[PDB]
Amino acid sequence: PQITLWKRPLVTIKIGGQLKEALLDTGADDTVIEEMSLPGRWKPKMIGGIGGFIKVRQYDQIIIEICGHKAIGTVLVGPTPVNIIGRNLLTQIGCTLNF
Amino acid sequence: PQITLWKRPLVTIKIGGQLKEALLDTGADDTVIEEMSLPGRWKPKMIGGIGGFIKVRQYDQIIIEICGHKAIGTVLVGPTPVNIIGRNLLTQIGCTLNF
Ligand SMILES: O=C1C(=O)N(Cc2cccc(O)c2)[C@H]2CNC[C@@H]2N1Cc1cccc(O)c1
Numbered sequence: 001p002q003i004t005l006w007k008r009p010l011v012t013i014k015i016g017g018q019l020k021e022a023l024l025d026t027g028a029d030d031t032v033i034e035e036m037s038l039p040g041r042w043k044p045k046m047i048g049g050i051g052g053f054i055k056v057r058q059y060d061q062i063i064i065e066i067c068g069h070k071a072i073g074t075v076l077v078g079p080t081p082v083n084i085i086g087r088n089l090l091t092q093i094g095c096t097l098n099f
Numbered sequence: 100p101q102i103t104l105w106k107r108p109l110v111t112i113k114i115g116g117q118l119k120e121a122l123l124d125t126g127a128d129d130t131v132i133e134e135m136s137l138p139g140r141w142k143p144k145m146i147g148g149i150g151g152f153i154k155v156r157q158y159d160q161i162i163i164e165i166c167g168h169k170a171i172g173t174v175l176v177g178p179t180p181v182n183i184i185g186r187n188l189l190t191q192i193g194c195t196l197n198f
């Protein structure tokens with residue numbers, strides 16, 4: 001699809017068998033999702049936000065659907081204001097910026 | 100142009116007679132620039148996300164040139180670690196997400 005930016009670019013994702021709303025965020029290096037259960041071992045990760053740094057949990061090779069497009073990759077879990085699909089997965093689904 | 104997301108989508112902007120590097124950020128509602136002088140009245144605002152909030156100065160009707168495209172809108176100025184072009188200006192240059 002082509003998504004304009006007059007409103008927040010919110011889409012539906014599927015992760016852990018559940019539908020969630022998430023923001024397509026080209027300003028985010030990484031994908032971060034609100035607290036939920038994911039399989040496997042995790043590693044620590046620091047995000048640098050506009051207001052400061054924050055530590056989250058990194059899960060690798062997680063299955064996730066974004067607007068119906070299947071992806072498998074790194075998902076961070078922590079206290080994000082909104083679920084964020086960052087560049088790591090935007091690249092997987094072939095998303096570009098155009099003007 | 101078409102901009103892939105393998106790396107941060109940084110572009111050159113011209114604002115207030117100055118050249119700066121800024122991030123095209125579809126997850127940002129607003130545009131926020133590091134400390135600099137801008138003309139006109141301003142009012143204080145708080146903007147935030149995963150790492151906390153920062154206090155910024157809101158300037159309205161500011162002309163910017165983003166990667167060669169002129170636009171006008173509100174620009175926030177404050178202690179942001181990265182210059183951010185948000186949706187309020189991305190729309191004006193015709194920027195969309197495509198996949
Ligand atoms: O921390 C923030 C942040 O505060 N904002 C909000 C913001 C920032 C500037 C202006 C505005 O109106 C809103 C977000 C927006 N996209 C990534 C901005 N980030 C960075 C981020 C987020 C998640 C994962 C990452 O790897 C990086």
Ligand SMILES: [Cl-]
Pocket residue numbers: 072073074088089
């Ligand atoms: Cl990944």
Ligand SMILES: [Cl-]
Pocket residue numbers: 171172173187188
């Ligand atoms: Cl505006």
Ligand SMILES: [Cl-]
Pocket residue numbers: 004193
């Ligand atoms: Cl449009």
